[PDB]
Design a protein around this motif. Structure first.
Motif, PDB file in Angstrom:
ATOM      1  N   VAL B  36       0.861  -1.170   0.000  1.00 12.87           N
ATOM      2  CA  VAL B  36       0.000   0.000   0.000  1.00 12.87           C
ATOM      3  C   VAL B  36       0.899   1.222   0.000  1.00 12.87           C
ATOM      4  O   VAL B  36       1.837   1.304   0.791  1.00 12.87           O
ATOM      5  CB  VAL B  36      -0.955   0.018   1.212  1.00 12.87           C
ATOM      6  N   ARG B  37       0.642   2.152  -0.910  1.00 13.47           N
ATOM      7  CA  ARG B  37       1.522   3.300  -1.076  1.00 13.47           C
ATOM      8  C   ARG B  37       0.749   4.598  -1.248  1.00 13.47           C
ATOM      9  O   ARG B  37      -0.397   4.597  -1.693  1.00 13.47           O
ATOM     10  CB  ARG B  37       2.413   3.108  -2.308  1.00 13.47           C
ATOM     11  N   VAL B  38       1.383   5.715  -0.891  1.00 16.61           N
ATOM     12  CA  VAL B  38       0.877   7.019  -1.316  1.00 16.61           C
ATOM     13  C   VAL B  38       1.746   7.469  -2.481  1.00 16.61           C
ATOM     14  O   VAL B  38       2.951   7.626  -2.340  1.00 16.61           O
ATOM     15  CB  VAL B  38       0.919   8.076  -0.202  1.00 16.61           C
ATOM     16  N   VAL B  39       1.120   7.650  -3.635  1.00 15.95           N
ATOM     17  CA  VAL B  39       1.819   7.990  -4.864  1.00 15.95           C
ATOM     18  C   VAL B  39       0.991   9.080  -5.515  1.00 15.95           C
ATOM     19  O   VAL B  39      -0.131   8.828  -5.962  1.00 15.95           O
ATOM     20  CB  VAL B  39       1.888   6.782  -5.824  1.00 15.95           C
ATOM     21  N   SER B  40       1.532  10.292  -5.554  1.00 15.15           N
ATOM     22  CA  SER B  40       0.768  11.437  -6.020  1.00 15.15           C
ATOM     23  C   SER B  40       1.143  11.843  -7.440  1.00 15.15           C
ATOM     24  O   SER B  40       2.283  12.210  -7.701  1.00 15.15           O
ATOM     25  CB  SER B  40       0.973  12.620  -5.069  1.00 15.15           C
ATOM     26  N   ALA B  41       0.177  11.799  -8.357  1.00 15.50           N
ATOM     27  CA  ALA B  41       0.449  12.233  -9.724  1.00 15.50           C
ATOM     28  C   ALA B  41       0.711  13.736  -9.771  1.00 15.50           C
ATOM     29  O   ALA B  41       1.539  14.204 -10.548  1.00 15.50           O
ATOM     30  CB  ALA B  41      -0.699  11.865 -10.647  1.00 15.50           C
ATOM     31  N   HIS B  42       0.004  14.484  -8.929  1.00 15.87           N
ATOM     32  CA  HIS B  42       0.091  15.942  -8.940  1.00 15.87           C
ATOM     33  C   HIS B  42       1.239  16.496  -8.118  1.00 15.87           C
ATOM     34  O   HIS B  42       1.873  17.465  -8.512  1.00 15.87           O
ATOM     35  CB  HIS B  42      -1.220  16.556  -8.461  1.00 15.87           C
ATOM     36  N   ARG B  43       1.514  15.872  -6.983  1.00 16.47           N
ATOM     37  CA  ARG B  43       2.529  16.393  -6.078  1.00 16.47           C
ATOM     38  C   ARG B  43       3.895  15.715  -6.260  1.00 16.47           C
ATOM     39  O   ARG B  43       4.925  16.291  -5.895  1.00 16.47           O
ATOM     40  CB  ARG B  43       2.056  16.271  -4.627  1.00 16.47           C
ATOM     41  N   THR B  44       3.902  14.497  -6.812  1.00 14.85           N
ATOM     42  CA  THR B  44       5.157  13.773  -7.066  1.00 14.85           C
ATOM     43  C   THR B  44       5.172  13.084  -8.431  1.00 14.85           C
ATOM     44  O   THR B  44       5.253  11.858  -8.518  1.00 14.85           O
ATOM     45  CB  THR B  44       5.447  12.713  -5.980  1.00 14.85           C
ATOM     46  N   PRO B  45       5.085  13.873  -9.510  1.00 17.29           N
ATOM     47  CA  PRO B  45       5.001  13.256 -10.839  1.00 17.29           C
ATOM     48  C   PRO B  45       6.229  12.387 -11.152  1.00 17.29           C
ATOM     49  O   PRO B  45       6.084  11.319 -11.741  1.00 17.29           O
ATOM     50  CB  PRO B  45       4.925  14.462 -11.783  1.00 17.29           C
TER      51      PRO B  45
ATOM     52  N   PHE D 143       8.492  25.390  -2.923  1.00 17.35           N
ATOM     53  CA  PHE D 143       7.190  24.968  -2.426  1.00 17.35           C
ATOM     54  C   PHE D 143       6.806  23.628  -3.038  1.00 17.35           C
ATOM     55  O   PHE D 143       6.321  22.731  -2.348  1.00 17.35           O
ATOM     56  CB  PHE D 143       6.136  26.032  -2.761  1.00 17.35           C
ATOM     57  N   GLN D 144       7.021  23.491  -4.342  1.00 14.43           N
ATOM     58  CA  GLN D 144       6.641  22.262  -5.020  1.00 14.43           C
ATOM     59  C   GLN D 144       7.479  21.103  -4.507  1.00 14.43           C
ATOM     60  O   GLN D 144       6.970  19.998  -4.311  1.00 14.43           O
ATOM     61  CB  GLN D 144       6.784  22.401  -6.536  1.00 14.43           C
ATOM     62  N   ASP D 145       8.767  21.362  -4.291  1.00 14.00           N
ATOM     63  CA  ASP D 145       9.663  20.353  -3.751  1.00 14.00           C
ATOM     64  C   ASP D 145       9.220  19.949  -2.352  1.00 14.00           C
ATOM     65  O   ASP D 145       9.274  18.770  -1.992  1.00 14.00           O
ATOM     66  CB  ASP D 145      11.108  20.863  -3.726  1.00 14.00           C
ATOM     67  N   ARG D 146       8.776  20.923  -1.562  1.00 18.32           N
ATOM     68  CA  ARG D 146       8.266  20.616  -0.229  1.00 18.32           C
ATOM     69  C   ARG D 146       7.027  19.727  -0.294  1.00 18.32           C
ATOM     70  O   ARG D 146       6.875  18.827   0.529  1.00 18.32           O
ATOM     71  CB  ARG D 146       7.978  21.884   0.582  1.00 18.32           C
ATOM     72  N   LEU D 147       6.151  19.971  -1.267  1.00 15.25           N
ATOM     73  CA  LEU D 147       4.973  19.123  -1.437  1.00 15.25           C
ATOM     74  C   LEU D 147       5.387  17.687  -1.730  1.00 15.25           C
ATOM     75  O   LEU D 147       4.799  16.737  -1.206  1.00 15.25           O
ATOM     76  CB  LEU D 147       4.077  19.621  -2.571  1.00 15.25           C
ATOM     77  N   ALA D 148       6.384  17.532  -2.594  1.00 12.73           N
ATOM     78  CA  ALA D 148       6.893  16.208  -2.918  1.00 12.73           C
ATOM     79  C   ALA D 148       7.487  15.534  -1.685  1.00 12.73           C
ATOM     80  O   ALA D 148       7.378  14.317  -1.519  1.00 12.73           O
ATOM     81  CB  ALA D 148       7.931  16.286  -4.036  1.00 12.73           C
ATOM     82  N   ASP D 149       8.122  16.312  -0.819  1.00 15.35           N
ATOM     83  CA  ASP D 149       8.722  15.737   0.385  1.00 15.35           C
ATOM     84  C   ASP D 149       7.649  15.260   1.376  1.00 15.35           C
ATOM     85  O   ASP D 149       7.816  14.234   2.033  1.00 15.35           O
ATOM     86  CB  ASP D 149       9.693  16.714   1.058  1.00 15.35           C
ATOM     87  N   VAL D 150       6.540  15.983   1.479  1.00 13.84           N
ATOM     88  CA  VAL D 150       5.479  15.522   2.373  1.00 13.84           C
ATOM     89  C   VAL D 150       4.893  14.210   1.871  1.00 13.84           C
ATOM     90  O   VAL D 150       4.676  13.292   2.657  1.00 13.84           O
ATOM     91  CB  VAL D 150       4.382  16.591   2.652  1.00 13.84           C
ATOM     92  N   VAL D 151       4.668  14.113   0.562  1.00 16.56           N
ATOM     93  CA  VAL D 151       4.200  12.857  -0.032  1.00 16.56           C
ATOM     94  C   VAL D 151       5.141  11.701   0.296  1.00 16.56           C
ATOM     95  O   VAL D 151       4.685  10.633   0.702  1.00 16.56           O
ATOM     96  CB  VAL D 151       4.002  12.953  -1.561  1.00 16.56           C
ATOM     97  N   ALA D 152       6.452  11.908   0.148  1.00 12.49           N
ATOM     98  CA  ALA D 152       7.398  10.844   0.484  1.00 12.49           C
ATOM     99  C   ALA D 152       7.223  10.414   1.937  1.00 12.49           C
ATOM    100  O   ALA D 152       7.260   9.225   2.247  1.00 12.49           O
ATOM    101  CB  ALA D 152       8.843  11.276   0.216  1.00 12.49           C
ATOM    102  N   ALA D 153       7.027  11.387   2.821  1.00 11.93           N
ATOM    103  CA  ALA D 153       6.844  11.108   4.244  1.00 11.93           C
ATOM    104  C   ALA D 153       5.522  10.395   4.532  1.00 11.93           C
ATOM    105  O   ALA D 153       5.479   9.446   5.305  1.00 11.93           O
ATOM    106  CB  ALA D 153       6.931  12.400   5.060  1.00 11.93           C
ATOM    107  N   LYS D 154       4.438  10.867   3.928  1.00 15.08           N
ATOM    108  CA  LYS D 154       3.144  10.220   4.123  1.00 15.08           C
ATOM    109  C   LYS D 154       3.135   8.807   3.552  1.00 15.08           C
ATOM    110  O   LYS D 154       2.496   7.904   4.106  1.00 15.08           O
ATOM    111  CB  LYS D 154       2.026  11.040   3.491  1.00 15.08           C
TER     112      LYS D 154
END
Lengths: 164, 170, 167, 167, 168, 168, 164, 170
Positions: B36-45, D143-154
């Motif tokens: 199970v993963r969190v993978v964001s198309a918008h925030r982590t393309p 800011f965008q990089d910070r958003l990516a970092d929160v995703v990695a953490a979550k």
């Protein structure tokens, strides 16, 4: 060779749409069969088709229906095989009825739903299903994808021209 | 527990988890290992693409992806893998997931996504199980057994409801 | 030398997206056009978005239809403002296109215009460029005044037409 | 000293529109907020729009619900880019708000964001301001990089959670 | 109102027992007109075989109308209709999302050949009343009871109006 | 199939004669089962008095079902239902805009107390078939004709399938 | 004084919504009456109410209904007076059915439709109708509008505070 | 012909004319003097406001306003006049006027617009006529006569359709 994918629809009038699924399967050399099978007008035939599918060697069934589109769901109710539903747009509502009638299956019986009129994609989805644990076929899908990208580059070339 | 996953259950935000957990549960019912993963198309393309591209090599056979609103994750993952991708439209605060549904299912010709009902993560799990069973007679027999059990439950509920109605009539 | 990129998933989108190029040309804003598919060329799409700022672009206008992910995925990969044009396809009259583009969750915005509204996407890009630029902002005002003048003329014409009708 | 105006038809819109003010504040963009009604104060609305550029505003974010005319009428009266936020009311979940804002005919554009998406309207205004401004554009990327970092953490957290579940 | 132990004339069926809170109104309406009814859980999706068996066996048993409720991709009324000559009334049951719009479209939009009489979303009570009207069509005595029912609906409105004058 | 000069058993009515191209299918279905029918233009909006008179007079005349077609803000089926004990079948007629979605919602969404049996948008043929099913409910001979009709629908599909093999 | 505007609805359960129309009329001192009149459950009463309205001195009828909302249209069918329809939202569909059922009148019989739940505005619309050729009442509407603007200025004041 | 107008029939663009002409026609049927204008809320907000503000003083008693898409004209005119405003949703290329309808009818509390059916300019004209007749017994009797004539036409069509059906049966 015996068919591995069945492509079925409630009426031969669905063929202008569903033909794309057959075309997609043929592009990947997957043996397939096509049938008119109606949930509402041949329920016994529909039930037999679904029940018999796995024994006949089918691995996926693509089913198209419009309006109160029940064929995909009822086929899925009767087989353990994955069923892909293609919403066929009819004269009114632009296939919105078809879409909701197929995709909104309650808990217990899933139907893999594609875009309204998206028979080509149903064919490609069936191929991906067959490829999931078949490295040779999976490599063929990857090659197909690379070639798709090449088509876009050609379209982009055409656009440069049009924009001139 | 510490197995290599055969199915990925991914989602655009961890707030999708309460819905997507049903996919994981369905998979476990059939003893199919899943991650199970969190993978964001918008925030982590970039990371989304890396996940999709790396999936098949890692032994994944199906990806279940859930997202809401302008739901792009299932489609963009499907664009970057040859694996079948199942999309779960997650309903958000407004529109009851109609936006999620249309943004997932209406893929134009070229890249398919197997779309299930709004909120239908459990069925996403069951669908992945059917895909895995299609050419696996043992798992397929397990699916048929599951179907028969569902049918037996309906019969029990039918009898119960008749008794309830009979009581009301009496 | 382009300042605005006008991109779309298919050359079949051009009958709509051409209007964006036309609007930009009316304001003499250098622009480039490209077929860039989020679904069929994700790598090219990502490179386009990532490289946009370095290449000197200030705004990207992106059109797509159906499950329209191009504007959102481009916006995810650039700090530039992205304008999304919902392109109506064969079914649903672009309602699917609209919801797919506009309903971005918190974090990544897309400026969405009307279904088929590529012309307005062009005008919007011009406003974004004009917000700080005095000459360009004056051109925008002059444009708006010209729109008001055509309305005055069409109104007068309609009145004359109805007059002829009655007489 | 404001660079962005955040306006709305009613103070009842604030629970939504507050997010726009918050986003702007995160980027230290000076902003003003106003209740300005297209329907109940058309004169004030017109004066606000007409005077915006002279007052030094570069972008206007406007929220309204139902038959939502505020963003469009403001956009009609200024050369500045206007971002429209559809505010969902008691019925229809903001679908009426959305169509009323986004479906502008040719000539007058409104940059429309998601239903209730005031936060994104703020982020969009920031992108418009950053397109040319090097420092601000770098802040956006950060800011965008910070958003990516929160995703990695979550993501990592979710994996640990599911791990605990199984064990 | 209907005594226990009569042979049913109307079937009230649904895909899941979770539909009962809604479908109960259909049974209640039938009972008010003393029409013997049976209530069943019959799933098109989970018990297709049993669903067909129910439909094909209905008329022979003396059922004259089937009321069927289902939600979401609501296939039960249509599939039952495909396997019986009896009129089938479909009740769209609203689920967690979409307010029964999916239920409505999946029931009412039957293509040519197999009709389903569709009622309002959640309108099980009206399905019961409609079944009673079907039974009354050629039954003058029952039909006279329906007219009286309609006439008495008007008296209720008079009381509501009285309540409104007070509120105003 | 139905001979001229019989007393009607079913009314096929519509708000405007422009609805006839659609509603004709209902009359055709009735004729195929030899059910005597009358066809009328009855407007809820332009002739409310006449509409009520028609509805209230129907059962006394021996009508057993009314099929009513209307489009847009489609009030005819509902208002007729309010003034007759007979089952009323509503056919949503699609007009120039909205593809009959307005017609559908304005017919099917009857609140509690007055039901209308709603069929698919433009589904007049199915309305006719549904009326036949209503008449067949307690009429074993007619009901057997319906079953045969259903059985023969299956044979048509076999021919369509044959056509499809050729096309493939 | 005899009522000049009638405010009617199919059920007393519509009152939480329709009360706003009565309130709006009272703000402008327009004599009005309120009635429960159901198109589906009291069609004869409905027909009489509409037919008798003008003779009784009514100049406008405001009618609220939900779902398959037929009351406004059927009243308009039976009177020459202008009829304003208020779509009342029910348990499902958020009054979208109510709205289409009222507004989509085919050529020949118009209904003035207001927003879903918009009984207050129906009241204000009736007042504007009465004001159209009544300069004194029209001046009262203008004054009302000026005061509305003052309320917004107060709300704006409240916002400045909240944003601090 | 060269009369002072009592009703204004206005529209956002002259391409709306083919639809809005029906309002003018209905008004003429009742001998109500009317003017037809292009008044754009989006392209001429100042002139739009001037039109609305000046209407009552000029002797207008009702304004019929048609617009499509994000249709703001009826609402913004209503905001700037005490006169009753009738809004006609004009259907555009996409959405069949559903956007026009919602953008006109869904006015929040404070400023009402009398909304008619999508494309329903004729009914807009008839509605203006009813408003003018409400306290004018002579015009009101003309309206009743109009209604009776509609009813007589339905009866003629009813008889004709019965004869057509009788012929088909024979």
């Amino acid at each position: 060779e015996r068919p591995r994918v069945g492509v079925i629809m409630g009426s031969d009038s669905d063929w202008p749409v569903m033909a794309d699924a057959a075309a997609a399967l043929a592009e990947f050399d997957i043996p397939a069969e096509v049938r008119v099978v109606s949930a509402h007008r041949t329920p016994e035939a529909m039930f037999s088709y679904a029940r018999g599918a796995a024994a006949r060697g089918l691995e996926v069934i693509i089913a198209g229906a419009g309006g109160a589109a029940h064929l995909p769901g009822m086929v899925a109710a009767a087989t353990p095989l994955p069923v892909i539903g293609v919403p066929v747009p009819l004269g009114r509502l632009d296939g919105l009825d078809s879409l909701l009638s197929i995709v909104q299956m309650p808990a217990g019986v899933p139907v893999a739903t594609v875009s309204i009129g998206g028979a080509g994609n149903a064919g490609l989805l069936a191929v991906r299903m067959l490829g999931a644990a078949n490295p040779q076929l999976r490599a063929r899908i990857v090659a197909f994808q690379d070639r798709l990208a090449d088509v876009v580059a050609a379209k982009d070339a055409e656009l440069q021209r049009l924009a001139g």
